[PDB]
Design an enzyme around this catalytic site. Sequence first.
Site, PDB file in Angstrom:
ATOM      1  N   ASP A 248      47.597 -12.160  37.603  1.00  0.00           N
ATOM      2  CA  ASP A 248      46.374 -11.409  37.874  1.00  0.00           C
ATOM      3  C   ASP A 248      46.594 -10.627  39.159  1.00  0.00           C
ATOM      4  OD1 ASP A 248      45.207 -12.825  35.720  1.00  0.00           O
ATOM      5  OD2 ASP A 248      44.455 -14.383  37.084  1.00  0.00           O
ATOM      6  N   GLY A 314      40.933  -1.874  32.672  1.00  0.00           N
ATOM      7  CA  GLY A 314      40.363  -0.560  32.905  1.00  0.00           C
ATOM      8  C   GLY A 314      40.985   0.588  32.135  1.00  0.00           C
ATOM      9  N   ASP A 386      39.692 -12.120  24.070  1.00  0.00           N
ATOM     10  CA  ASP A 386      39.108 -13.170  24.915  1.00  0.00           C
ATOM     11  C   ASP A 386      37.997 -13.850  24.115  1.00  0.00           C
ATOM     12  OD1 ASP A 386      40.648 -12.188  27.347  1.00  0.00           O
ATOM     13  OD2 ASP A 386      39.494 -10.392  26.821  1.00  0.00           O
TER      14      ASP A 386
END
Length: 532
Positions: A248, A314, A386
């Site tokens: 991350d 994004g 997810d």
Amino acid sequence: GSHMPVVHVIDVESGNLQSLTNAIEHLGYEVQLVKSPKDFNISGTSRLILPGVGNYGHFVDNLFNRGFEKPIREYIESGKPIMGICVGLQALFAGSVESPKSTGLNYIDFKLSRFDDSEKPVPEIGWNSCIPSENLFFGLDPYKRYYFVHSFAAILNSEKKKNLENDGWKIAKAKYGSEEFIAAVNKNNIFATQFHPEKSGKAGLNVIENFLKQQSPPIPNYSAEEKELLMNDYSNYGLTRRIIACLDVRTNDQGDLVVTKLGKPVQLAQKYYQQGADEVTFLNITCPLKDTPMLEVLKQAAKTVFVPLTVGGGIKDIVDVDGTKIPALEVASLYFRSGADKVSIGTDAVYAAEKYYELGNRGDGTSPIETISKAYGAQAVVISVDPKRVYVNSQADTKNKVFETEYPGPNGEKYCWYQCTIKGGRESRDLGVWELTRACEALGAGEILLNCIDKDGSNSGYDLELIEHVKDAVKIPVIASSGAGVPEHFEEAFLKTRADACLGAGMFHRGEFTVNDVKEYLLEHGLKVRMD
Ligand SMILES: NC(=O)c1ncn([C@@H]2O[C@H](COP(=O)(O)O)[C@@H](O)[C@H]2O)c1NCNCC(O)[C@H](O)[C@H](O)COP(=O)(O)O
Ligand code: NI
């Protein structure tokens, strides 16, 4: 400009060119980018590289549009060394079924076709090997692995291999599933590889060095024990068990980049590469588009990390700081030219999928999935799923496809479906994983990054039923993600499910185990893994 050997690289200013340039410089050469036929003359070029990436037509059209056809042929005619990479090899053929109306240099008189998806996942994404031959070249070693990422290939049969043979071509073959195809070609001064050497680690760098130094060294003197271990047994269709390391990328208080709540993500990526990672995925979760911190991380990582890099976070249609409307295609292009090989789509994937079902199972050609895959191919688009399990007593309780689970719910429910979430899992949607993946696969997605919110960072293993549920739904490679804690979990996923790869974040970041620790264990249990 003359203090080191100059290598001319044709740049159609599209896709990841960072890796190839860095690989060449790392070998002690200087790179000269040729964006136009005016940027190079035949007599002043001793080493030419034709790098290709994305959709065949999108590449060949761009290449010929710039007026490169005659210059390339004149160069080939001069008898000097040329190396084609990916679409750089495909351009040598009559054309490709990926772009029907497009043409090729036609040095090889047949077209590239799509792999058969009835027996295996298409595109082929992973580490495959060259089949042992007496006519291998430029150090292509059958006991090593190279990275392939394509849906189309020059698929062979007896007739084709023979004509090529009588035509004077040396062919490095590879097999994916039951299909044999051209992994590399060599005739006189022409060399080309279907795989990406700049993405194949040390084994890949060696192929590039061998071409630049025009040498075909003998393959190492392996023992009958080493060969039997390193040979391709064609389990998992001929691809090794792909181990992906993920990290991350967040912005703290000062504004600096960290992996724990801009050198940290860069150095960790280098560490992952040095410790055996087959791929490195960056989840961006952190300002004008051009100055985005994540782009610089890719650039820096791409200097030493010679394996594919995936970036997610994004990737959609945005409104830059200046108000300019930048479509998802241009955002992905910026990341690609910065070092990324694939982009991951999460939130926008759920939106596009919902829209897809409203239009009567069709796309309007405007979603990130559609535009990016038409330009760079399906292999460039990853869908980040997810999900979370939702129990129901029967199929009658929901419109979403359910499956019978071995694990009954709180009230004894024997059925369940997986609900999709968006925006880092902060919002649920009335779309199932079955519906999402199938939709995205139709829109052009080439791979599924199958996370599981319930297993995330639990170090308790992968959600095996979820993996099998998605594998029943689509014909594109599915990556098992969320829950990895020990080497045994990777083995479990690879033996008990049809998972096409395994991803790990927490365990690698904690230094609990390295990618090599996981690989050593898998290797010890008879599975094939990349070891370079
Ligand atoms: N705010 C967040 O936490 C967050 N925001 C975005 N992501 C991920 O990045 C993708 C791209 O985001 P877009 O919605 O397209 O902007 C998402 O789909 C999502 O998976 C986020 N988290 C990541 N969530 C799950 C994983 O993918 C994880 O990396 C594995 O479960 C590792 O598991 P492990 O530690 O068990 O090995
Ligand atoms: Ni010089």
